[PDB]
Design a protein around this nucleic acid. Structure first.
Ligand SMILES: [Mg+2]
Ligand SMILES: [Mg+2]
Ligand SMILES: [Mg+2]
Ligand SMILES: [Mg+2]
Ligand SMILES: [Mg+2]
Length: 749
RNA sequence: GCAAGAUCCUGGUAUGCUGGGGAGCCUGAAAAGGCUACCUAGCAAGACCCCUGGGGUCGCAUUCUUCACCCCCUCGGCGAGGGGUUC
DNA sequence: AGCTTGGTGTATA
DNA sequence: CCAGGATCTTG
DNA sequence: ATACACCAAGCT
């Protein structure tokens, strides 16, 4: 089903986006824009706060797990050494908070003549020193730690500061003696400072070093008269540390292929999108005859010869030598902007965008389709013409700075031939923009991997059986068997929970017995409850909130001419507690038990409609799905959304999240984020230079449309559009995610 | 070419949270509650393998999960990794 | 009652 | 937060 | 330090 045409490929690579064009050619002039799509990616970023990528967060978590594993193994080996020496380690409970510190202070101060008491104090001191040993260089050997100046100069400065503050001198002033003395003298004192966060002045200021703990242990050994091999073994067990190695980063030569990852996140996202587009374009129109790529001027902050440019040249030249691409040329930013400038093509005129800035011309970054338009413009480019345009800009910027207290055109026959050949490019762009064939899409994240819950462990609340129970207290029951038993109490014919959060579900009953499969709970027995009336799971003996939702399952019930819709918001914790995070599981259609937080905190109408059997699952929505409202647009606008839709009549909206049980958060697909953020900045510091549409767009972002699901899915002709790699909506029901209509979708199974 | 770095990766540290404790202080004194520290265990759910338990290794990346089709790579029908699937 | 929307808490250095 | 190993960039 | 999920006044 491949019809070979003559077409060229245009790729603009940005920090958060990539624009791609397949332009069919007839006589070395543009003939047909086959596909133009801009793909918005996160560049591998999973933490928007710190800018850390998903791979970096995963590596930090994995190394934290490995640190805990090695710490557990090292402390177990120390415990076996202390058992071999007969020294008793510090017990888990039923000891004073300062037994370890007082043991360290007493062994570093005086000699202990009692045998069992000395061994007990030595075991307490050595176990506590292994739990708190301070930092050393990981490449420094134990022998090199022993060759360090003991004590360290930072601890000498700290000890002099402590002697100045408290007017006392301890010989020898180890951290064990000073901490024990300060915990006896000024109780409640903090020992180490916190950079995270009334005037509890800390005892120490610098980070503890392993040489100081080693010096204190050797001072304790010299005072107590321990044998040399015993001291050597105790040092080698307390300060044991794995040396750093290189397991994973194990780095004419053959150029890498398209399917091979490059290791860097932004380049990997751009490579994956370009690889999918190139594969689909090859299967539908044959191979391209050249590939023109525009790396951005950015994409490195905190002809291009950057790492992204080198990786893209090597992989696209691998594809070229495997498929027959005649040349591959990669340019440096921002050549395509001036190439768009000389043909009189503006995004604000091409897509009929209203003006946002009162003074000066608005930046093209407002409409996200500018990437695909730049890819179309890039398709026409050649390296000689790009050189002439770069020389023209370099000549123009100096005359522009000179003429402030120009514009002069450099002459080129290749530029003249290019401008003659690209006369109809503007007409093609108008024609393709009129029928809305230029698409802005985002890649879907469908794998159920990530943080399963929030990190903060929370304390359990607790409720008696025999008291009065409200709806929130029913919803917060931790144990699923007790939850199902209270479910059978409040509704014996029901399988799900349909109560208001504030209503009084059931009164006090002094002889209520909750029967189970393994015990019987009396009316005086106390049920473990989640602390708050929100989605939570039981992890490691505590409660944690659920993370962000993986998806929302769409349910429909009622008549054909007027149905009702609701979302079942499913997080990774629901799939974790349902046992669905395993092999061979379709996580969008698998049945969730009633005790999951999804079905606990679903809307009451959805619960009652599923219990009545009327409501069936007709589809699913992930963050990043595109809602095409059709040519009608949004007919249920109210509030600031109406004033937004007067000047930006958007029909394509992107799902970002599901903020409660009845609402879905939608942003406009074609409108950018950072442009509206700098509009907010100019609203903050430059009054009256912003138009009314700019003011409304600045107020609309960042939270966009917090939209009622009943007000969204009540539109006939609304489609959940899932694109192919070329930016075309997938309408054939296959094994890839397809476009569907909420008003007409078949029920699952 | 000093090196400002960018991407990770490896080894550590100190807080923080939860469970169990408690040195000082404040209440309650019948009894147990809080604050500041400090001690101790754990810090994704879990999964696999080896000798009841234990110990080791993976588990937040590769944005269309699973399934289906096609292509590529390593080892010995056979799994593990990747990649693509046009509207 | 129900939709707008304003504010805020998240593991961190 | 720390030190330092590997690519690869820019100086 | 983000952005999303949750909470809790206001309009209608
Ligand atoms: Mg673990
Ligand atoms: Mg400890
Ligand atoms: Mg330590
Ligand atoms: Mg671009
Ligand atoms: Mg401790």
């Amino acid at each position: 089903g491949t019809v070979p045409v003559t077409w060229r490929l245009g790729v603009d690579v940005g920090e958060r986006s990539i624009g791609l064009a397949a332009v069919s050619y007839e006589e070395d002039k543009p003939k047909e824009i086959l596909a133009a799509v801009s793909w918005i990616h996160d560049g591998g970023v999973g933490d928007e706060r710190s800018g850390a990528s998903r791979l970096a967060l995963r590596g930090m978590a994995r190394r934290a797990r490995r640190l805990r594993r090695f710490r557990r193994a090292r402390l177990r080996d120390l415990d076996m050494l202390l058992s071999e020496l007969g020294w008793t380690p510090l017990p888990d409970k039923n000891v004073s908070p300062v037994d370890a510190w007082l043991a360290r202070k007493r062994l570093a101060e005086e000699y202990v003549v009692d045998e069992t008491e000395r061994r007990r104090l030595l075991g307490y001191a050595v176990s506590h020193m292994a739990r708190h040993r301070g930092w050393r260089n990981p490449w420094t050997t134990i022998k090199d730690l022993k060759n360090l100046p003991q004590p360290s100069d930072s601890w000498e400065r700290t000890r002099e500061s402590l002697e100045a503050r408290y007017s006392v001198s301890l010989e020898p002033g180890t951290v064990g003696q000073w901490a024990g003395y300060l915990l006896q003298r000024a109780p409640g004192i903090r020992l180490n400072p916190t950079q995270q966060s009334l005037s509890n002045a800390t005892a120490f200021e610098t980070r503890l070093r392993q040489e100081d703990v080693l010096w204190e242990l050797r001072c304790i050994a010299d005072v107590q008269g321990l044998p040399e091999d015993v001291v050597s073994n105790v040092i080698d067990a307390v300060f044991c540390q794995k040396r750093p190695s290189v397991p994973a980063e194990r780095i004419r030569p053959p150029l890498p292929a398209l399917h091979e990852a490059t290791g860097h996140p932004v380049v990997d996202r751009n490579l994956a999108i370009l690889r999918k587009f190139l594969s689909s374009a090859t299967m539908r129109w044959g191979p391209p005859q050249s590939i023109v790529v525009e790396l951005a001027r950015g994409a490195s902050e905190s002809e291009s010869t950057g790492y992204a440019a080198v990786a893209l040249r090597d992989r696209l030249l691998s594809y070229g030598e495997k498929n027959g691409v005649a040349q591959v040329a990669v340019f440096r930013g921002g050549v395509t902007a001036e190439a768009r400038r000389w043909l009189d093509i503006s995004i604000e005129r091409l897509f009929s965008r209203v003006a946002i800035f009162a003074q000066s011309t608005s930046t093209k970054r407002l409409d996200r389709r500018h990437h695909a338009v730049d890819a179309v413009v890039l398709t026409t480019l050649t390296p000689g013409v790009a050189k002439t345009l770069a020389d023209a800009r370099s000549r123009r910027v100096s005359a522009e700075f000179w003429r402030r207290p120009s514009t002069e055109e450099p002459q080129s026959p290749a530029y003249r031939q290019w401008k003659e050949s690209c006369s109809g490019l503007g007409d093609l762009l108008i024609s393709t923009a009129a029928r809305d064939s230029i698409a802005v899409a985002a890649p879907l994240r469908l794998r159920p991997t990530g943080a399963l819950h929030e990190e903060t462990l929370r304390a359990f609340s607790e409720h008696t059986v025999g008291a009065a129970w409200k709806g929130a207290e029913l919803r917060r029951i931790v144990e699923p068997e007790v939850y199902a038993a209270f479910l059978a109490l409040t509704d014996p014919g029901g399988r799900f929970l349909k109560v208001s959060p504030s209503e009084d579900v059931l009164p006090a009953d002094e002889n209520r017995h909750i029967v189970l499969s393994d015990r019987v709970l009396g009316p005086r027995d106390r049920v473990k409850l989640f602390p708050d009336d929100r989605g939570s799971i039981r992890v490691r003996g505590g409660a944690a909130y659920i993370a962000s939702f993986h998806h929302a399952r769409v349910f429909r019930w009622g008549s054909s001419h007027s149905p009702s819709f609701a979302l079942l918001r499913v997080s990774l914790a629901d799939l974790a507690v349902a046992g669905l995070l395993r092999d061979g599981v379709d996580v969008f259609t698998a049945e969730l038990p009633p005790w999951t937080p999804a079905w606990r905190y679903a809307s009451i109408a959805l619960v009652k409609a599923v219990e009545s059997g009327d409501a069936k699952q007709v589809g699913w929505l992930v963050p990043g799905d595109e809602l095409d409202f059709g040519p009608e647009g949004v007919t249920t606008a109210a509030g600031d959304l109406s004033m937004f839709l007067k000047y930006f009549p958007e029909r394509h909206w992107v799902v970002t999240g599901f903020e409660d049980d009845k609402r879905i958060n939608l942003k406009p697909a074609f409108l950018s984020a950072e442009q509206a953020e700098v509009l907010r900045t100019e609203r903050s510091d430059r009054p009256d230079t912003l138009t009314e549409a700019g003011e409304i767009l600045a107020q609309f972002f960042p939270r966009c449309w917090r939209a009622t699901v009943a007000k969204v899915l009540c539109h006939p002709g609304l489609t959940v559009i899932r694109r192919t790699a070329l930016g075309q909506p997938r309408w054939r029901r296959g094994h890839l995610p397809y476009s569907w209509r909420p008003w007409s979708a078949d029920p699952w199974s």
